Write a protein that binds this ligand. Structure first.
Ligand SMILES: *O[C@H]1[C@@H](O)[C@H](n2cnc3c(=O)[nH]c(N)nc32)O[C@@H]1COP(=O)(O)OP(=O)(O)OP(=O)(O)O
Lengths: 906, 340
DNA sequence: CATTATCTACCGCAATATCAATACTT
DNA sequence: AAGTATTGATATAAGTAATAGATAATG
């Protein structure tokens, strides 16, 4: 009877936010008119109600004007005014939706968008208008679908969305009113006055105007309060009832909320290919894996939640809670006669203080929001439906509270189902606690010994979390370590450990799954043994080895008396070098690795605050070590990069009849595409964006049009193909492992590389994951990718220059001259493309006579395809057929040998 | 008695970094005669002069020959130009120094502590007669240096703590048209407003006679500049240049608030003033409508306003009780929530 | 040949007003 | 031919002159 009770709440929790908000603060008006005249945050809800009640007549009047203007049908004599002209632009859109719903949508979106976009006390007007328009169109779609189901353009242009958003935002600005108190400096007399709540203004940054909306400090004073949850309600939140399993890409996840399987940000090609794959039916395994991930139950850790609530109510700055502060602390202004360098330093300090203060406020607000959700979901069981991104990795549909969040969100989550520890449950819980404390190179027995060494500390930290030694704070994952300490205290209370029913998920992870895939694909013995694919006696740490190498490099380079080298000679650490290497193998840049290492070492503060200069040399040493360390992965990613270049710099032969004629070179519209081992189609979304000044009521925003067809960003394709391929393989392995575990009946959820389950079923899960990795990687995926590209891009021609003096080039020159007289006009590369295309069309004719005659015809590219040495030999522009490079040689290494490995996932 | 360099020596130089120099001694003599610097400085024999971005050094050599100052200093950072100047002016009383005039720390080191060049402070009533600063900012990519120097005119901090010092500026013609603008002209901007508020300027020379239409007719007929041709500047590829004379004047307003109000008010420079006020802050439109009794000022665009009206509006802005703070006016790109 | 931005992957962010030329309809 | 809307170009602020580290495009 638990499902039916939760079913009613979810239908209530899936109620329209616009209807609830209409009823919510309308109710809050009743107590205000009864209790008395006040300005508490309940009166903030009252102010929102008053804003709605005064804004509704203006929207009604605008609808009346548009309806009365659209009645006539002669556009020349109608709407001579500029304002009345745009009425034909937008009016047929506004009449669809209830004006009250429209008003509440505008108010809620404006409240939600505050302190966003780099504005101190507001949001950029372009974001505000486009977001209001998008919310209105989504509400329109929901209403249309619901009424169509009840009774038994299609895509709104971004220009119309921006126009509607600006109209409504301005019309609310003209209405919103709030009272502020202040003194005048003539007489130092304290006075009161009311002002509009919002004021549209402009700002500058490096010589550029930013149309910004501004929200009054009086409004912010209440929007900071904990009643923000009451004033604004989330739309997507964790579910109590079992999610509907993934079958159709247009129907799944939430019971009443439609979502797509892929998170296609700004491209329709990925949507089209995913829809084609769904219609064909090649992603049933993906459906099964997503259902397994999204079918597990969770509940909030009550004791850890109580501890977090007490720490937050204290108000002091905890490990990750920023704390509570009310006003900024700005240093005294320097004298106006001081040097411009001093003035610039003071302005930089002011900017830094404002940045830190805003970031701390945002952290506090997010933590308060998270705790409010946790309190609203205390005790009950919660479900996480899972979506997928284009590159293939899984994410939930609850952005606010999820296990992919920070340490607090993870520690506040446990499995609703409990399973007995059995013979190995206590051992694996102790392993998990050892994992949470940053020690991993030690074997399982040593981990158990480390956990056994600190029973008294565990008992203290569990009997009294605060007001004690607080050993859980000095852990890399504090809240999860606290939950683990709680459960070990409970089991040590019992005389028989193997009878305790537990709820704590155990962390099992594969260190650098990308490196594992490199070693597996290349068949490299050295990489496999370094990454523990080969069975060994103890886990081996690639991060530790490369960190020792970087220590050697810095010892060599310290002879220059460098302060950074002297300090970090004995301070190079596993964490910094690991954060550098994990992304580096993925293809990070020098500046990216510098950013990561500086970010990780900045809290240590061993060097100066401006450690970028030092981290430059540190990254240089790291790259110098990695170049010698890794070769097979480097070769594989180079083959991927060469393939990316060839695919990007290619033109199909079916583009047109004559040419695009847009410049000498037709635009490039070729993106790298292939198929995951589970049948999902991966498409790189990278493209160019064309942003045009779109006029609106408030101002002329600077937005693009994602529906327009644009060229492909070659640099982004090159940078994205390798990591996208690697992580698609990783997520496919994760999906297969999840599907098999769900078939076996385990409770399975995962965050990318790491896999979560109870301590009793960890061995079965480990066996399942080894088997699934073997099954997925038994095939030569690099070769299969080569044939996939060959079949997908067989009729493609490159573009390149050629020597004027090449003997074959003069033949191409004559064929150009020959083509000119045959076509009757000047010869072009586009004419060559058309001639090649029609020749392939001739081969498509089933008539054998036309085929031989078609084979008799000679085309410029047709000369190249007969040739086999012009590309190697390589002015004038020439057309080269798309010849992808040969795959790098594959070393000899048996895949199945890792089945006996112990520290593959640990 | 310093050796004036020639066109053949100028052509030998390789890198100019966009800087263009006038090289005609006759035109320089005419310019100096028009300036008549001896009128302002009754005793230029003891005068000390500093040069920013000297370059060829023709102007420095001609100035020293004509006036015989006491101590003359040059600050050049370009490498080839530095070797050229050092090689040419060896064994001469004229001084050459290697320092970059872009960095404020260079000025602080030169005047404050090391004290190679020690100017004397004068009163603010009259132009300092013992300090002359001549600079060349003809480079196309360094107008920000000129605007920062005008802000230093306003703030009385960088080099103007010594008082009112005259500035002779070789600087591009486009920035000259923007800077020397008058109310109502299409080239009116914050350059012109700052110039009007903090100094008085007179055009002294121009490179192309075609560009004189952009300026004001009364102003050009008053100044009577010395028109020359593009031949007399060695690098001919660049845009035409202009020479201006900057004289600091006394001002009575609060620089920070005036700066804020002008910058925010004049963004919509072609909007009637009865509409542009609401962007100053919340309720600014109502407040300024209440406090502005004149109905002739409420229909003039900010491009048509002058420094007096801008100072008046600054005064009303300060008398505003509910004024937004001017320090919290920026966007922080470092901060971004960017939640997943 | 110097310049010129450009920098792992994702997971709901990076400009605007004004003025001149041109072509389009009337 | 004379308006008139469209399309394109240009200035704004005023130390990212806050990297050779490494490099693929540019004109
Ligand atoms: O703590 C982070 C984080 O909460 C938030 N944040 C910033 N960028 C992102 C993002 O791309 N995706 C998500 N989910 N969250 C984001 O802002 C805070 C930034 O503070 P930090 O100084 O700790 O992070 P920083 O950007 O400096 O380093 P990094 O995010 O590149 O690693």
């Amino acid at each position: 009877a638990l499902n039916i009770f939760n079913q009613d709440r979810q239908k209530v929790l899936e109620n329209r936010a616009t209807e609830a908000a209409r009823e919510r603060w309308k109710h809050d008006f009743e107590e205000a008119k009864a209790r008395g005249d006040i300005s508490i945050e309940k009166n903030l809800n009252v102010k929102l109600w008053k804003w709605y009640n005064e804004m509704l007549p203006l929207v009604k009047e605008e609808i009346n004007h548009c309806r009365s203007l659209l009645s006539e049908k002669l556009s020349d004599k109608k709407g001579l005014n500029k304002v009345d002209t745009n009425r034909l632009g937008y009016g047929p859109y506004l009449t669809l939706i209830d004006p009250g719903k429209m008003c509440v949508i505008t108010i809620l979106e404006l409240l939600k968008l505050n302190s966003t976009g780099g504005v101190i006390e507001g949001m950029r007007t372009a974001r505000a208008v486009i977001s209001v328009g998008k919310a209105i169109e989504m509400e329109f779609r929901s209403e249309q679908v619901l009424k169509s189901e009840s009774q038994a353009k299609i895509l709104w242009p971004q220009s119309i969305r921006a126009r509607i958003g600006s109209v409504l935002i301005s019309m609310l600005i003209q209405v919103a009113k709030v009272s502020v108190q202040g003194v005048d400096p003539v007489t130092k007399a304290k006075v009161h006055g009311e002002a509009p709540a919002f004021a549209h203004g402009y700002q500058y940054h490096n010589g550029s105007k930013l149309g910004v909306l501004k929200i009054h400090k009086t409004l912010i004073r209440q929007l900071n309060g904990e009643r923000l949850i009451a004033s604004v309600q989330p739309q997507l939140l964790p579910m109590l009832v079992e999610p509907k399993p993934w079958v159709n890409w247009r129907s799944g996840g939430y019971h009443y909320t439609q979502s797509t399987l892929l998170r296609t940000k700004d491209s329709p090609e990925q949507v089209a290919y995913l829809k084609a794959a769904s219609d064909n039916g090649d992603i049933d395994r993906v459906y099964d894996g997503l259902n397994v991930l999204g079918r597990t139950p969770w509940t909030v850790n009550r004791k850890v939640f109580d501890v977090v609530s007490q720490v937050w109510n204290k108000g002091e700055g905890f490990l990750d809670i920023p704390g509570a502060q009310d006003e900024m602390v700005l240093p005294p202004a320097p004298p106006k006669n001081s040097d411009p360098s001093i003035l610039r330093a003071w302005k930089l300090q002011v900017k830094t203080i404002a940045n830190k203060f805003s970031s701390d406020r945002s952290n506090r607000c997010d933590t308060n929001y998270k705790l409010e959700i946790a309190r609203a979901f205390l005790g009950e069981k919660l479900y996480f439906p899972h979506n997928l991104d284009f590159r293939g990795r899984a994410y939930p549909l609850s952005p606010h509270f999820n296990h992919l969040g920070n340490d607090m969100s993870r520690g506040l989550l446990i499995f609703w189902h409990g399973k007995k520890l059995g013979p190995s449950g206590l051992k694996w819980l102790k392993i998990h606690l050892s994992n949470l404390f940053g020690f991993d190179k030690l074997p399982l027995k040593d981990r158990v010994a480390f956990t056994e060494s600190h029973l008294q500390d565990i008992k203290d930290s569990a009997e009294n979390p605060l007001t004690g030694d607080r050993w859980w704070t000095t852990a890399d994952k504090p809240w999860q370590a606290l939950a683990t300490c709680f459960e070990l205290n409970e089991v040590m209370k019992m005389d028989n450990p193997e009878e305790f029913i537990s709820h704590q998920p155990v962390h099992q992870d594969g260190t650098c799954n990308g490196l594992q895939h490199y070693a597996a694909l290349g068949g490299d013995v050295e990489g496999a043994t370094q990454v523990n694919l080969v069975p060994s006696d103890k886990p081996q740490d690639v991060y530790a080895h490369v960190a020792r190498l970087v220590q050697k490099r810095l010892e060599i380079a310290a002879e220059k008396g460098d302060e950074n080298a002297k300090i970090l000679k004995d301070k190079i650490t596993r964490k910094v070098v690991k954060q550098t290497v994990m992304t580096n193998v993925y293809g990070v840049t020098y500046v990216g690795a510098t950013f990561q290492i500086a970010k990780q070492l900045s809290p240590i503060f061993d060097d100066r605050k401006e450690s970028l200069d030092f981290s430059k040399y540190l990254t240089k040493h790291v790259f110098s070590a990695i170049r010698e360390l890794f070769h097979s992965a480097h070769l594989i990613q180079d083959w991927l990069g060469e393939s990316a270049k060839r695919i990007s710099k290619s033109i199909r032969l079916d583009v047109d009849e004559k040419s695009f004629k847009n410049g000498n070179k037709p635009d490039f519209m070729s993106s790298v595409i292939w198929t995951t081992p589970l049948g999902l189609p991966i498409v790189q979304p990278y493209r160019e964006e064309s942003k045009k000044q779109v006029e609106t009521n408030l101002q002329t925003v600077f937005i693009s049009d994602p529906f327009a067809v644009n060229p492909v960003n070659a640099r982004r394709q090159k940078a994205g193909l390798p990591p996208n391929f690697i992580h698609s393989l990783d997520a496919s392995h994760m999906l297969l492992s999840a599907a098999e575990c769900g078939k076996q009946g385990l409770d399975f959820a995962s965050v990318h590389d790491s896999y979560w389950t109870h301590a009793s079923d960890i061995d079965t899960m480990n066996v399942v994951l080894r088997e699934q990795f073997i099954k997925l990687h038994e095939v030569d995926l690099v070769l299969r990718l080569k044939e996939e590209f060959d079949q997908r891009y067989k009729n493609y021609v490159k573009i390149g220059k050629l020597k004027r003096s090449t003997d074959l080039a003069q033949k191409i020159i004559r064929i150009r001259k020959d083509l000119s007289r045959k076509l009757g006009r000047s010869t072009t590369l586009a004419d060559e493309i058309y001639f090649e295309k029609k020749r392939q069309e001739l081969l498509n004719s089933p008539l054998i006579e036309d085929r031989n005659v078609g084979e008799k015809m000679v085309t410029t590219v047709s000369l190249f395809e007969d040739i086999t040495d012009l590309d190697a030999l390589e002015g004038m522009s020439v057309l080269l057929p798309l010849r992808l490079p040969e795959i790098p040689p594959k070393g000899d290494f048996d895949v199945t040998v890792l089945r006996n490995s112990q520290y593959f996932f640990s | 008695s310093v050796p004036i360099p020639g066109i053949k020596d100028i052509s030998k130089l390789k890198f100019f970094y966009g800087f263009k120099y006038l090289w005609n001694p006759t035109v320089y003599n005419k310019i100096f005669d028009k300036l008549d610097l001896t009128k302002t400085y009754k005793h230029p024999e003891e005068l000390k002069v500093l040069d920013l971005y000297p370059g060829v050094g023709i102007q420095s050599a001609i100035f020293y020959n004509k006036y015989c100052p006491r101590q003359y200093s040059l600050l050049e950072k370009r490498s080839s130009l530095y070797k050229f100047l050092n090689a040419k002016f060896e064994g001469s009383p004229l001084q050459i120094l290697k320092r970059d005039p872009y960095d404020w720390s260079t000025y602080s080191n030169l005047i404050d502590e090391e004290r190679i060049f020690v100017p004397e402070v004068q009163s603010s009533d009259h132009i300092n007669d013992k300090f002359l600063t001549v600079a060349n900012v003809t480079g196309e990519g360094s107008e920000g240096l000129i605007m920062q120097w005008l802000s230093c005119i306003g703030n009385k901090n960088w080099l103007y703590r010594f008082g009112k010092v005259k500035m002779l500026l070789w600087m591009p013609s486009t920035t000259a048209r923007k800077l020397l603008a008058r109310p109502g002209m299409h080239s009116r901007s914050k350059c012109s407003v700052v110039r009007e508020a903090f100094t008085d300027t007179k055009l002294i020379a121009i490179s192309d006679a075609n560009e004189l239409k952009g300026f004001d007719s009364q102003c050009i007929e008053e100044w009577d500049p010395i028109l020359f041709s593009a031949a007399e500047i060695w690098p001919t590829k660049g845009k035409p240049i202009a020479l201006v004379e900057m004289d600091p004047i006394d001002f009575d307003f609060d620089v920070d608030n005036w700066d804020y109000v002008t910058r925010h008010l004049m963004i919509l420079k072609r909007t009637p003033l009865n509409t542009v006020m609401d962007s100053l802050g919340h309720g600014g439109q109502q407040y300024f409508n209440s406090r502005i009794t004149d109905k002739d000022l409420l229909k003039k665009c900010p491009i048509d306003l002058t420094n007096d009206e801008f100072i008046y509006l600054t005064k009303l802005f300060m008398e505003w009780p509910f004024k937004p703070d001017i320090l919290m006016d920026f966007v922080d790109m470092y901060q971004t929530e960017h939640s997943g």
